[PDB]
């Protein structure tokens, strides 16, 4: 069993199938529309330049949406948005998106090709420490080695009335169950790392930071995962298991318990003849 994250090709295909059969993206859309406003309501107060640091170039369309809400609250104010992404493929895509978008004259972009870690290391070399008004980490901690250290660092980069926003899958979610129980039995990679909003609050508690957590429901239609032979079904399987060609490369003893175990409540809910996997999300905001 080889980690799915080691086959850039498969991954994407799957990831893509994941978005196509989930309310993930719309879920964040709702957060940004009905909650974000009041959250970032004062990060611009008294500043003639609003700085926004985004760690991860995977949700370009979401980043842009954040800008939309920040511009609305602070008309005229120029915005400096830096992006810290390791994947050239991503940055590349991001950029394309920028060029095709309007109402971004009062925004300055700057992409840095590296990891949160590398970025962080560098900064320390600099003598001066630079602050920020808004930091955010959408679905990417999974790929961070030192969470506690990472959290504390960027918190210190927050300026006055600044805020840091983090998104991960919720403790009360299918993923949680899927990992607490089966994890050990899946390919242990050094790149990925199973983490839930739960692991998060404990770390933040022990760190002593003041945060606020919000959960919203999101689903993943895994119906094609019971139709033996279905191509689509196969990809999805690859995703949950974060493994390559899961079926044809895993112990049926296991693939047997899952097939059963997934169609159960604590993992999924049965709807319009559909089997919906609990993809609930958590949004954490941290004060400076
Ligand atoms: N829903 C997601 C999960 C992971 N990464 C993701 C990356 C961005 C979009 C959603 C994601 C890793 C493990 C589990 C779930």
Swiss-Prot record:
InterPro entries given in the database record: HHMT-like, SAM-dependent_MTases_sf
Effect of residue 56 to D: In MRT51; no effect on protein abundance; no effect on protein localization to the cytoplasm; decreased thermal stability; decreased ligand affinity for S-adenosyl-L-methionine; loss of histamine N-methyltransferase activity
EC number(s) reported in the record: 2.1.1.8
Binding locations of substrate: 24, 279
GO MF annotation terms: histamine N-methyltransferase activity
Keyword NADP: no
PROSITE patterns the UniProt entry points to: SAM_HNMT
Catalytic activity field: histamine + S-adenosyl-L-methionine = N(tau)-methylhistamine + S-adenosyl-L-homocysteine + H(+)
Keywords: Cytoplasm, Disease variant, Intellectual disability, Methyltransferase, S-adenosyl-L-methionine, Transferase
BP term (GO), one: methylation
Domain of life: Eukaryota
Binding-site residues for S-adenosyl-L-methionine, renumbered to this chain: 56, 85, 90, 116, 138
Top class in the EC scheme: transferase
Pfam families xref list: Methyltransf_23
Subcellular location as annotated: Cytoplasm
One Gene Ontology term, aspect cellular component: nucleoplasm
Gene3D superfamilies hit by this protein: Vaccinia Virus protein VP39
Disease: Intellectual developmental disorder, autosomal recessive 51: A disorder characterized by significantly below average general intellectual functioning associated with impairments in adaptive behavior and manifested during the developmental period.
Oligomer and partners: Monomer.
Family: Belongs to the class I-like SAM-binding methyltransferase superfamily. HNMT family.
Role, per record: Inactivates histamine by N-methylation. Plays an important role in degrading histamine and in regulating the airway response to histamine.
Official protein name in the record: Histamine N-methyltransferase
Organism the protein comes from: Homo sapiens (Human)
Gene: HNMT
